[model samples]
Target: EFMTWPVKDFNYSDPVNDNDILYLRIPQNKLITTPVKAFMITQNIWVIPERFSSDTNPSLSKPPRPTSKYQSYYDPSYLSTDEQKDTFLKGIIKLFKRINERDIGKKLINYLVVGSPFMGDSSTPEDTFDFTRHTTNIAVEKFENGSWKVTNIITPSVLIFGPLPNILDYTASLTLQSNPSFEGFGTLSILKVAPEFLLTFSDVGKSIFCMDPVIALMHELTHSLHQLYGINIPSDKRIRPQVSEGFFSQDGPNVQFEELYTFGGLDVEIIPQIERSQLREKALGHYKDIAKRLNNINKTIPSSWISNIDKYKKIFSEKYNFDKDNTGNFVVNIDKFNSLYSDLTNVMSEVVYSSQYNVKNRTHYFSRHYLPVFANILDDNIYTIRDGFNLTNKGFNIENSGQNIERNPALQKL
Candidate 1:
């Protein structure tokens, strides 16, 4: 039997998070998998690992390079090794299985993953020189429904993972444009990941919450969710304008800014207040450690630096004071630290919306465009109360209906 959409309750009246419920939309046997291909159930997303080889795909076979802060070393010899290819194939399987657990993830359509030497072909003269310098962890190619089919391309690098050396520094923005007509649900989104990321962090660096592959993957997927069903600001002034050029435009209001709040919100919103207090305690410890290092008698310090050091010490003492109360334990004023961080939200708000579309009226534009979406995502009655998976349906096709709505007065009557 096809399972209930959200599976509201568990057997014996036990409660569960709505998103935690699993629905059976596709048969277990029907879900396909092979060394080279795999499919997620409701969303017919495909994962195809392009075999790494020097012959057919010359790019994959190129030699390794010296590591830099922005890049890391990945053994290019893995291209020739069948064992490495199998390892990545298994990683893709794991990723698909994890994604299937979420509501929005299960509905994705027309998605593909490719493992390649470079995220895209840099063989052309215009792009040839920068093959190894690519910094994108996942590049995307969005298509309107029915405009293209997965079978139309051969060994397509649509959702690529690669140029492996650059994975460590693969920074990305979850930035996206709005689609006001959406009922909530997006369509035909693509993503790429560097296959090397599947390996442990031993060679690259320690993982931050943002750069963790699992987090990075979900971050981009959240962007896809925004495109599928996010609301656009109703006012003509804030509504995103038409793109002047073909295939790309970064000039618009960011709808996916809501995900920044969704994934990382006010401490009370997602993180518990006590954990926030603990984090503050840890930060204070680091500062104390720095002060200890500065005072080491073994270290040679210039007497001339004393004035500046004294000035900083006075400033630090003024801004923060250590306390040993009844319990005789060092304590930082957690509330004050949290208050400072809370203020940073306003500072970052300015930076996040400093440019382009909103221009002089950025905060007003955000209050109108971004705030409602964030509110709705957290409201249980309006939707699931989940963060990234806020879309009500798979999303609407505004592109196809735009001209028709303009031409017909009746459709626009409401």
Candidate 2:
């Protein structure tokens, strides 16, 4: 039923240099049929259609049908492909070139040395592998565990497969987050898939990891570029639930500016019943402010722009029953979505300048406030993330006992 490898036999080597193992990649398969793109977050090699070695009369055969539940993503007029092998050679060459430019891969190569006992012995058992290698092809051995015969293997790496669109379109980049289920596999967590993600914990990371590995990777990549990889900075200093959820100080009248200053907390804290209303009010204001801020940021950093903030604001407001009582809320109707972007840009510029005096000591602090919501849009939403899904305010929903240890001294739910 399961495979086992001894503690001493475990291999942690890089597969890229393995003459046998190739990182088969392509522009997501669905993109060749429908207009959707896919992404993934894993480091394992895959046998995508674009990487097939044979042209073999390129079979359109029966085109890939878009998932019925998300028909809006399909483009029937697009070309369909069975498997395009040429994409792999081209992709590997390009990837190798990129890796050469960045020496990190050279040292990291030390991480991939394990051998595959399931397959017959080869000179480079760990080095030479195939992306198209199927899981069933591996040899399984019978081992005794108590009275029952268990299906076991020599602890070699196993291969897994999913739909074509999952590889080509959803996850153009390989980036998987360290999830609890993905960690060692024993938890109540469940993995959900978008075009590019293999996600779990429907209840957890709904906000932090948002649902997409590629997006999570993107966020982490940004942090990595700034040298924050694998380092868990204090949530109190780094995670402001309201701001991170995309609620600033201006969702609507029910939200207030005072709550915007609350920032991070030290303990499992409780707002009085009255404070709860204030928090809710501030959450709304933060959403409004965020809509403007995100729109503003899009202007300066336009290519990163995903969709219209106006649409997101409207959808989120309607979803949360935010009413427009004053012109402050009505001001959100600005057509260009430019002023907000400009204002946020100005604030960040000021923060950077102020950093000289320790005003906002961190780089892209606003991003720390907003990127959690943003990552879900790109990775979790699988690029189908339009106005509706990306804009929901995630602030008020995360006030759980598990979040702040100090709030519950005895770990009891308040």
RMSD per model, one decimal: 27.0, 26.2
Model 1 over residues 98-129: C-alpha lDDT tens digits? 44444333332222221111111112122111
Give the C-alpha miss distance for residue 231 in model 2, angstroms: 12
Summarize candidate 2's per-residue lDDT along 1-414 as a digit string, tens digits: 222111111111223332233332221222222111111112322222221111234332334654323111222222233222222222222222222222232211111112111111112122222111222122232223633232321121212122232222221122223221111110110111122222211222223222223222222222221111111121222223232334455322221111112111211132244643443343334335433332233221122333533443453343222345454453334322233222221211222222221111212212222111211122222122222122223321133322122321221211
Model 2: residues >4 Å from true position, as ranges? 1-46, 50-83, 112-414
lDDT of 1 at 101: 47
Stretches of candidate 1 off by over 4 Å are 1-42, 51-82, 100-165, 173-187, 195-212, 228-263, 267-414
* Model number with the top TM-score: 1
Worst 10 residues of 2 by lDDT: 181-190
**Worst-scoring 10-residue span by lDDT in model 1:** 369-378
Q: Tell me the whole-model lDDT of each prediction, alpha carbons only.
A: 0.29, 0.24
TM-score of 1: 0.29
Q: Per model, how many backbone clashes are there?
A: 6, 48
TM-scores for candidates 1 onward, in order: 0.29, 0.23
